[PDB]
Each structure stands twice: as C-alpha cells, then as structure tokens.
C-alpha cells in the first residue's frame, strides 16, 4: 500500500520561508518523479517542480525558480520543499504526488497523492476559539427530530477539529466552511437526531485548535 | 506558455444521464514524437485530486470505463456515459506537451436532483456568550436544491445587513443537497434592545419568503 503523508498546516509570517515535508512509504522511492502542485481558492491548480529521489535531479516551473527548493532524503524517504520569501501569492494548499509517468515506458503507473498542506502568510495574531453550544427554542424542527448546533467563533488561524460525541455522531452532522471576519474565523456545526435522543442521551460538541492547543467539550444541555 | 481553455464552467446532470467536458488548448499538444500528453483528473470534495486519463483516452487502472476521453491537437473531450454520485467533483484536463506543464481552470459537476425545501432552524444566544458582551443569533438552513437561496434578517421588522456571516457547504454526496448557515452578531446590550428575530429566506420551492423566527422576553 503506496501512501504518502504530508506534514501539517502552516501559518507564516510574510518574508520567512517554510520547509513542507512529504513522507512516502510502500514503494522504491528512489525510483520515481515526485512532483509539487499549487492550488490556491479552490479550482486553480499549477505545476511547480519535480525531483528524481534517486539522482536528486530537478526540474523547475520557472515562475517558481528562487521561490522553491526541492530536496529528498533517501535514508527517510521523504521528500521536502522549501518555499522563500514568504507573501500574498504563497498562501495555497500545496500538494506532493508520484505522478507516475515512467519516461522510459512512455506510460503510466497509478498517481499517489498526498493529503496536501495549507500554508498561511500572515502577521495576524493567534487566537484560541470559544465554543458556544446552540440548544433550540425555535431551532426545534418541533418533535419528531430536532437539530442542536456548536458555534465556534473568534479564533485564528485555521484549522479547527469539530466533531460530536468524539466522532460517535456522524451521520445528520453539517459542518460549515469557516468564514474570516476582521483577522478571526466563525464556523458552525449542526446535527439532526430524533426526538427520542435528544435530550434523553447527551450530545456533546468536542473542539479543536492545534494552533492553541486548545481542546474543548460543550454538552448541549437543554 | 499553454492556455488551457474549459468549458463548461459547471453542468448539473441528473445521475444516468451523460455528461461531456472540453478542454482547448493554445497550441497543439502533438509532441514530437507523436504521443499526445494530456490528462483527465478529478478533485472530488474535500480529496486530493486523481487522474482518470492519460494520453488523451487511455484510462488508469481502476477507473470506471463509463468515462471515455477523446480529441487531438487543440480540442479534447471528456465524456461519461451514465453519471453516477460519485461523479460530484471538478475535473481538470492537464497538458504535459509543452513545459512548463499547465491546468485548465476546471469544470465543476454538480447533481441535479429534485427540488427540496430548506429545513430551517433558528438559535438564540448562549448565556455563555451573552456573559462575554456578545450575541449571535444563528440560522441554519439545511438541505435544500437548487443551491440559490437568499436569507435576509429582520429585527423588529426591518432589515438587518450589517454583522451578518454566511457559509454555505458544497454538494451532499448523500442526498445531493446543500446546506448554509447565516449569523448574526450584535452587542449583547443591542440584543437586548429588541423583541423578535427573523431568519428569511427566498427560494425556488415556495411563491412567499420562507420564516423562521423568535421573540426575545423574560420567563
Ligand atoms: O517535460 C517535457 O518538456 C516533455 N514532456 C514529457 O516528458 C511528458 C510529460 C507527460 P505528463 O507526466 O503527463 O506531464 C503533465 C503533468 C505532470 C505532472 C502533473 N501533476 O499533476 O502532478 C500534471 C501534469
Ligand atoms: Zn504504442
Ligand atoms: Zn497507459
Ligand atoms: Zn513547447
Ligand atoms: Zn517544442
Ligand atoms: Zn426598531
Ligand atoms: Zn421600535
Ligand atoms: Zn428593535
């Protein structure tokens, strides 16, 4: 099982530089191109640079020659990027994969991804969240099912991990994309349960922000 | 460098019925040794993306042969035969020809479903957050198709603009529906200053504003 990780979000200040880590496992990594892709807001995607692990030989998108550096330790198997001189344009998701074009073969083998890293560039300061638990009064849906929320608001920089009763509570759960507002992100969370749970068996809102290393419960008590 | 052109920018399609994405691109991707390098790939939500394609109509292993790729030169095709849910996603095509290697700005392929009416909820503030000074009231409208919906605040009867946050979720593939939050923030003393609070919402499914309210009191 061919599997490649990628090391974690990241919050830059403008003019620094970062080194984003790859690790791959589950095949000779010596042996194929690994290649870096960019993607910024969503839809946008560009191709920056390739190195052979075995040769250390690379090759660079030139609009990328200065801002990246490519490098790969055998002895780890992992591939690495230094992006420098950190601005405006930086602030991406960047994402590690064994392509798989075999140069040789003229063809292909299955493309390996890894799960990409967000970078953020940004002097804002970092802020620890408060979790506000939303019991209905009108957000009752009446009987039958009722919906309960968490409200996270205030806290920088992303992410964030909401999850409810530890993950127990998956299903009829809506997590929403969390939205920045004057340098702090708000996200919310809501969960649909019968009548008959709620609030019989507590639901419970469990919040996350590594960047504080803030981890919080709210019971959302009636 | 190659401009890659697509088009549509997003198509819904109802599951089982084909769908088909172009891709133009500024020169012609003929490399000289006769291999055409352009490549399919798609970002399912929330995924890294995944190549479906190669060498403009080789599929890669484990893809499902609905999706067949076609084209030469500039103008390149991608089409599914029967759209299935996990179709839901954007497709990119990408050229390898010409260096340095270059995407098309992608196509977004959304589910068209049976229109659905948003199940509203409306939350007044915690006593936690009243406690800090603050007050949020919270909306959430869930589950409704099409995704164009418009919700407006109301205070006391008139329009509230200011102070409002709104998100939205990408497509369910469960239901094929979506789902948006709105959020309203005041002083804790504003909050206090008034009586009812509307969540109004304007959608396809209904000839009149769609309400969710409460009236703020003491008991
Ligand atoms: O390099 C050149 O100049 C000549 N061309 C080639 O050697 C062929 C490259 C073919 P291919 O690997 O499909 O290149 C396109 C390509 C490569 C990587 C990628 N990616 O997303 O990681 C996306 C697209
Ligand atoms: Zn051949
Ligand atoms: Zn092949
Ligand atoms: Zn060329
Ligand atoms: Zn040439
Ligand atoms: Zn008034
Ligand atoms: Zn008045
Ligand atoms: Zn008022």
């Known amino acids: 099982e061919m599997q490649l990780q990628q090391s974690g979000a990241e919050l830059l200040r403008p003019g620094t530089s970062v080194k984003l880590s790859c690790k791959t496992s589950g095949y000779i990594f010596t042996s194929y191109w690994i290649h870096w892709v960019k993607q910024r807001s969503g839809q946008g995607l560009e191709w920056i640079a390739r190195?052979?692990?075995?040769?250390?030989?690379?090759y660079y998108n030139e609009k990328f020659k200065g801002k990246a550096t490519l490098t790969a330790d055998k002895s780890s198997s992992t591939a690495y990027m230094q992006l420098s001189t950190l601005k405006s344009e930086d602030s991406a998701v960047y994402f590690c994969?064994?392509?798989?074009?075999?140069?040789?073969?003229?063809?292909?083998?299955?493309?390996?991804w890894g799960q990409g890293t967000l970078v953020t560039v940004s002097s804002a300061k970092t802020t620890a969240p408060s979790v506000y638990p939303l019991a209905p009064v009108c957000g009752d849906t009446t009987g039958s099912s009722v919906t309960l929320g968490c409200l996270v608001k205030g806290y920088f920089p992303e992410p964030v991990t909401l999850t409810w009763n530890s993950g127990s509570l998956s299903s009829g759960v809506h997590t929403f994309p969390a939205v920045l507002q004057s340098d702090l992100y708000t996200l919310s969370s809501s969960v649909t349960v019968t009548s008959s749970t709620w609030p019989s068996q507590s639901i419970t809102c469990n919040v996350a922000h590594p960047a504080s290393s803030t981890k919080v419960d709210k019971k959302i008590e009636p | 460098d190659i401009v890659m052109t697509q088009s549509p920018l997003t198509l819904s399609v109802t599951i089982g019925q084909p769908a088909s994405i172009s891709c133009k691109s500024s020169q012609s991707l003929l490399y000289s040794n006769g291999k055409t390098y352009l490549n399919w790939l798609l970002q399912r939500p929330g995924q890294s993306p995944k190549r479906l394609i190669h060498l403009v109509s080789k599929l890669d292993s484990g893809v499902p042969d609905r999706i067949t790729g076609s084209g030469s030169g500039t103008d390149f095709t991608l089409k599914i035969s029967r759209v299935e849910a996990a179709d839901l996603g954007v497709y990119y095509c990408?050229?390898?020809?010409?260096?340095?290697?270059?995407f098309g700005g992608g196509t977004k392929l959304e589910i068209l479903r049976g229109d659905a009416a948003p199940t509203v909820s409306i939350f007044p503030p915690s006593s936690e957050q009243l406690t800090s000074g603050g007050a949020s009231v919270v909306c959430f409208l869930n589950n409704f198709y099409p995704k164009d919906i418009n919700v407006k605040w109301k205070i006391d009867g008139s329009e509230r603009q200011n102070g409002v946050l709104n998100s939205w979720t990408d497509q369910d593939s469960k239901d094929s529906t979506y789902s948006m939050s709105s959020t309203l923030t005041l002083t804790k003393d504003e909050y206090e200053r008034h009586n009812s609070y509307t969540c109004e919402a304007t959608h396809k499914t209904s000839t009149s504003p769609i309400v969710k309210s409460f009236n703020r009191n003491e008991c």
């Open positions: 994969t064994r392509w798989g074009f075999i140069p040789v073969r003229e063809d292909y083998v299955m493309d390996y």
């Open positions: 190195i052979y692990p075995g040769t250390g030989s690379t």
């Open positions: 990408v050229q390898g020809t010409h260096f340095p290697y270059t």
